[PDB]
């Protein structure tokens, strides 16, 4: 995931 | 995540996979060249366990998963007198 | 007649002209003013019937009230929400914000204050172009509206209009001599706001208005603002203004090219290389006036490459995506000085993408640089620590060895951030106390996850010593959760929150290793929260004893051997035996309850209210207070 | 048919069972229906009437294993220079094959062997790999391994996967031992390796000392140690990390303290900051390195 | 805390649901298990139809009548309407 949802 | 335990009569007792791996052989039957890592069927063919006692085995799976860590006067497992001595060797085969 | 006023307010908002006329029929002059002019509360908004009539665009209600009842257009009330608690706005301001031209014309003709000022010096023209209706903006300006009037942050009618995609009003305001050299609260002009909005039409009219490009309060040109916004169209229009000289236009081309290498929604390799090569071509073409860049020494976080000075170097790493991103980052911080708002955030996106394909080692060091700069900038990094602990948990679940000095420096950053939140909540008033406490709790939870993943990693002796030293420092800082839970309470609780990511695979509470580490660093083993529950009271209530009896036995014996008074009473006088709700935990505590005459004597002292103040050892007054 | 004890002919059920256990130890393909049907065959043999055939099943399985790993041993020894890659190719086939066969033989393990000196099939298959394939090849393996490690020191790039799997085989082959599971790995590999790396780094310390001053010897030594933390991370067991680093320290920076302590004077009294940092990291790990340098700095 | 044995002709599914849940959740579950959309399957109770609206709490699936050690059976019919044709379990042997 990471940048998929943690980026914001 | 739903293993399909077939019985001697074709009664496919679909049960939660985490529930069924409480038994050693079902854990072993899905380990090795029986994994089928595709989450499509994951079926197990018990060619020697009658359906009427495999159903009780599945109730035991659910009962054990529910009342594992509770130990707060757990209700007694209903084993009919006639189905015992079939459940005994069924749990011998399907360890625990 | 309070219910009648609410009915009048309800009728005007619902547009019931028939019901409003019936409610207001046969009413005296005092009754009319009481019914039309009272402030009513509904849905978190305190608005008058005339104010609420303009927001909903009920022209018939507005005309009926103004023509017959001649209600004054100076009513004040709380309007709108979502960051808008603006008070003192009249009915004209509400209609302008709602984009209703007919209500504005009716109000102004009836005597609305065109140059009305709210609490934050907001003009009705400011809200008129906020919605985006040209007729409302044209009507107010023709009705003697002062465009130069701004708020306390100096955002005029042109600046508020440039936020959105309303090309008609910004061009019209430029026709009415809008000042292009105005400075906002942070030294910002209208060009800064239009550059980040990605509106080439608004920006290109400002340069035709002789915008007089000047840096903001922080010291960045509006061209650089659009350069970091990955808006090539906005950037590639200032070259014809003939005022950027050569250094400013070539640093924007590099910044524009650098920004395309690190963006969630504007990432593309081909466009990034095209602009970066063009920036390098213009530097190394004239020869006599060749432009040379002052490259910083290679940061260990920024790989090992010290940019690409030679022209062959840039062409060689065109096919390498990693070097393409790395070269953009170095010039991204070099232009801004690595102390800007949006320097670390593109690095965070670069690492997160780099971690999505089983690559970890270079992902970590990028976030260390992001964590390092934000600490210098007094920026809270609770989300950064949370995602960092999540990535370590994902590594550990993947049985991957996590480097320990990174955990050490991240723990140092964590305790520094917790101290920053401590003195922040010391200085921050009730305005943002809820957000400050939320960030405080998040910081404590992330620190606990970091301690847990440190205990889940086999580290060296010196590394473990450093980690325990840092935990000792934070324990001496003595954090306190809003429930009064110290660090020990959260490490033994089962209600301690764990984020939905891979931390559930590694981090869990209560955890024996974390409690042992906290007790090793001299944590307050007898800490009492607001309710009264000690460190022992929280785990004797644990509801799953048999499943993880190892991690309940270990924590019980660790707490007891660390001096946790097993007979301690909360504010309700409940010993941990009483607050057990479990046979297993109760008996496991009873096996650790070394009965002492001191406990019985203290209980007998405090039971019958014997004055023990200063008549016993000072180490016994707190001991009696335990019971 | 039910789970009651029934009359079973061993010479036919075993033949119906050998075709599966022979194809699961080689990681071939066996259909899921056959694999699920075999679990009844071990059960039928283990509760056969009127005498359980658990002894016959275990003895025949042990005979088949010693006739299979020995067949693998001849093939691995058949290849002259490829014995490392032939061992690894026949180990990952057999390490997972032994685990799958242990899964197949679960009823035999938990109701005949564990209930009654006998080893479970998971333990037996591995213990019969270290008796018929490792130990006869022990001289060849821990000679070609150290040649590969020595070539890795020499700058060559061996197959990391093969060497790591072969070295990890020595500790995985004794994963079922309750007491000292790494005794074989330290006996067969670490002691022949720590002695080997000791000689190599003593030679390298003497060679570096013959062409470099103290301002260059320390940088090269720290280069070797930094590489040694990698040349042992991708080849050896995680328990061997601290032993190899500590042994290469006390062969290259603790056998030459006379060279380092004497040159510590000129390093400290001229503020050679780049050299002083390198000496401190070098002398900290040595047992008696710092207590002189400290003194010098104080002076 | 309700346990159900959803019955096909032979196929049986062992499901667990909350004390406050409706039929739509079980329809979604059997869609996720049997790969059958819920628009052609309707649940049952001792051979009488159930509607998608009402909850299982008042439907008769109380916590003390669908305990995990003895879950209550639930019918299931698939459109190819077809009547419920659940096959019972095997006959237990007589006491020896």
Author numbering:
A (entry chain L): -22 to -15
B (entry chain E): 17 to 112
C (entry chain H): 1 to 627
D (entry chain C): 1 to 116, 135 to 317
E (entry chain F): 2 to 81, 85 to 100
Could you pull the original sentences from the published paper?
We recently discovered that FEM1B, a substrate receptor of Cullin 2-RING ligase (CRL2), recognizes C-degrons containing a C-terminal proline. By solving several cryo-EM structures of CRL2FEM1B bound to different C-degrons, we elucidate the dimeric assembly of the complex. Furthermore, we reveal distinct dimerization states of unmodified and neddylated CRL2FEM1B to uncover the NEDD8-mediated activation mechanism of CRL2FEM1B. Our research also indicates that, FEM1B utilizes a bipartite mechanism to recognize both the C-terminal proline and an upstream aromatic residue within the substrate.
